Amino acid sequence: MEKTVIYLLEDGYVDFVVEKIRTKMEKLLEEKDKIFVVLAGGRTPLPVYEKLAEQKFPWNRIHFFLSDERYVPLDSDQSNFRNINEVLFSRAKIPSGNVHYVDTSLPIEKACEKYEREIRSATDQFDLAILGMGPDGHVASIFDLETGNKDNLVTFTDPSGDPKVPRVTLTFRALNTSLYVLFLIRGKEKINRLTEILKDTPLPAYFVRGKEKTVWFVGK
């Protein structure tokens, strides 16, 4: 059945997480020809991607999707695409067509719709989602429950978060098509958020679950 698993790590956080994601992707690749993985930006996931890019994977069989994007230029240090491209997309030799991101050069709604069409065309279900969670409990760029509950795979927001800029984000519906959802969080503040989630506090992250499993890698 489907449930949630929480790992509390005291040491070697990044290496542990990398090994777990590595094993899972290896297993997935033994089962299917192509796998689709969603990636969140942020300071905790980046180091992990940096190491994953060094692994010998058949990159042409792995497709990546950003979980969300800040509506700013793609070469901005505030761009999730720029940051993930720096540690992964431009380091691992992943075919250009296998990488999907939000085209912020377009009007925000058009960037949303283009991204949604791309996602639907590539797959009807994600295999793995590697997500982070803010100290406020938000996931991807879902700060308000209304945003997460949008009846689309992709939606956009008014200026939100920090940086306080408009965002384009996958919805709860899109994220929940993931077979496995992995949350990567570190620190007392986020541990506080997770405990509130354990007590059924409806923070955004509380609503994202994998169809098979949801795993939290916690760096206490």
Helix (H), strand (E), coil (C) string for 120-132: HHHCCCCCEEEEC
Name the burial class of residue 202, with classes exposed (0-12), middle (13-18) and buried (19+) by CB atoms within 10 angstroms of its CB: exposed
Read off the DSSP letter of residue 181.
E
Domain limits of the chain?
2-220
- The candidate with the shortest Cα–Cα distance to 130, out of 57, 201, 35, is 35
Return the ∠ at Cα 178 (arms to 175 and 184), rounded to 5°.
75
Cα distance between residue 145 and residue 134, in whole Å: 14
Resolution (angstroms) stands at 1.7
| Expt. technique | X-ray
Single-letter residue type at 6:
I
Helices in the chain by DSSP H: which ranges?
A: 13-31, 45-52, 80-84, 108-122, 145-148, 172-175, 188-198
The vertex-122 CA angle with 121 and 123, nearest 5°, equals 100
- CATH number for 2-220 (one of 3.90.550.10, 3.40.50.1360, 3.40.50.2000, 3.40.50.300): it is 3.40.50.1360
Is the Cβ–Cβ distance between 126 and 177 less than 8 Å? yes
